[PDB]
Amino acid sequence: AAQTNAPWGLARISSTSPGTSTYYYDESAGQGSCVYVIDTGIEASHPEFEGRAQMVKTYYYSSRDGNGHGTHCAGTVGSRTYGVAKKTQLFGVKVLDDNGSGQYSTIIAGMDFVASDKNNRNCPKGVVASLSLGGGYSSSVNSAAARLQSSGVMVAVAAGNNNADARNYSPASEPSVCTVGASDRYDRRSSFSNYGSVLDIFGPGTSILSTWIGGSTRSISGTSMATPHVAGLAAYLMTLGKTTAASACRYIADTANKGDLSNIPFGTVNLLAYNNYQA
């Protein structure tokens, strides 16, 4: 299939080269997979989700996304116009409040919840969790992400937007999950993006157009915008039987666009998420 005039990040993950505007993807589109968006929530009402989004757990007074971040990243995973995996099921898990922050314990609790909740959903193609969040290093945050990954969920987490090594950040520093850095539309590492050997892959993360609360759209930047590209792509490739949750991060690294990014510090992978789609 082809999305013309697609957002640049979508086009980027279906293309070996920057600058294109068409998103080429297999028609299956992540159908049969599920992606938990662990964030500020999702405005499941947004038309772009076509009913495929739903709130499954909040840790605050409302399940409402009063911030926008979570709806934005759900959209990059699987909105019709802004999504990587346009037929995937989205489950919102609101661990961040409407100000965009959340205690470590609440984030740990939300990952434990996904590990269990998936067992009472229908995701025949497998389960992905997109974690567009992160704070300072925390071994218990890290081990929550690892348990989530161990439980059979492909976990993708943001490297963090500190322009520093991601080893000092969590869950970015957990080795078993897929830590995702950001690139911009000129195949440069995003100026804010963390880096380091714990990075596994880069996604589009600068000026990423996606759904916003109130039924709108918005373009924002961050490794938290790159994360859902890779989550969506995992959900996509899983639906295609190309890989599984345990193997998706390494599969995506193996099949990435290599060496295309500039300003990659020595000791950081130079790999860009790529769906290798051939019509």
Side-chain angles (χ1 to χ4, degrees):
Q3 199 192 336
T4 54
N5 303 308
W8 80 262
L10 291 204
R12 190 63 190 89
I13 66 170
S14 83
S15 167
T16 65
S17 57
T20 79
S21 59
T22 314
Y23 179 30
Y24 301 107
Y25 66 91
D26 183 291
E27 300 77 68
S28 40
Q31 166 85 53
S33 55
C34 306
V35 186
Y36 290 75
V37 186
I38 303 183
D39 218 346
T40 59
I42 313 176
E43 189 187 83
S45 88
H46 199 304
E48 279 283 344
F49 294 126
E50 317 172 298
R52 291 173 290 100
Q54 63 171 283
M55 284 302 288
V56 298
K57 188 68 166 56
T58 177
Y59 284 91
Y60 304 91
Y61 61 100
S62 205
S63 73
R64 205 181 289 111
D65 188 10
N67 176 285
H69 209 241
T71 298
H72 192 271
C73 296
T76 292
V77 174
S79 63
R80 146 197 72 164
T81 309
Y82 313 104
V84 174
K86 304 185 185 301
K87 295 284 185 283
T88 203
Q89 250 303 316
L90 303 151
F91 299 117
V93 180
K94 182 177 182 31
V95 294
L96 310 171
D97 58 29
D98 291 331
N99 280 332
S101 85
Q103 321 274 31
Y104 275 174
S105 43
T106 297
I107 291 163
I108 291 170
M111 295 181 243
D112 287 358
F113 164 99
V114 175
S116 182
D117 177 69
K118 80 194 187 33
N119 297 310
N120 46 253
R121 310 281 160 183
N122 244 325
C123 315
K125 306 297 189 208
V127 177
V128 180
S130 193
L131 274 70
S132 314
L133 57 96
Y137 181 80
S138 155
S139 34
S140 61
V141 171
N142 274 14
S143 84
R147 291 195 292 284
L148 182 58
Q149 178 72 45
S150 172
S151 89
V153 171
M154 192 274 174
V155 185
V157 315
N161 303 324
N162 319 97
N163 186 40
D165 186 305
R167 71 163 91 234
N168 279 310
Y169 295 93
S170 285
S173 48
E174 169 52 50
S176 51
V177 307
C178 211
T179 294
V180 183
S183 62
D184 63 25
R185 75 173 72 242
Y186 303 102
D187 278 2
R188 319 191 271 242
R189 182 187 43 111
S190 275
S191 52
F192 46 80
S193 179
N194 291 343
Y195 50 83
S197 34
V198 74
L199 278 91
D200 312 311
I201 189 78
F202 279 81
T206 284
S207 290
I208 300 302
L209 176 68
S210 185
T211 48
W212 195 255
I213 49 169
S216 55
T217 64
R218 190 173 290 212
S219 174
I220 63 176
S221 299
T223 58
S224 34
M225 274 43 78
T227 303
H229 284 89
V230 168
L233 175 62
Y236 173 80
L237 298 163
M238 270 156 47
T239 286
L240 289 179
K242 250 104 184 163
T243 194
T244 59
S247 304
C249 188
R250 159 194 316 227
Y251 179 86
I252 292 173
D254 290 337
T255 63
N257 281 315
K258 192 166 208 101
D260 301 5
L261 297 183
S262 75
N263 209 25
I264 306 290
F266 199 88
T268 294
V269 291
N270 194 325
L271 303 162
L272 184 57
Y274 177 44
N275 72 7
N276 313 72
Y277 180 60
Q278 319 294 344

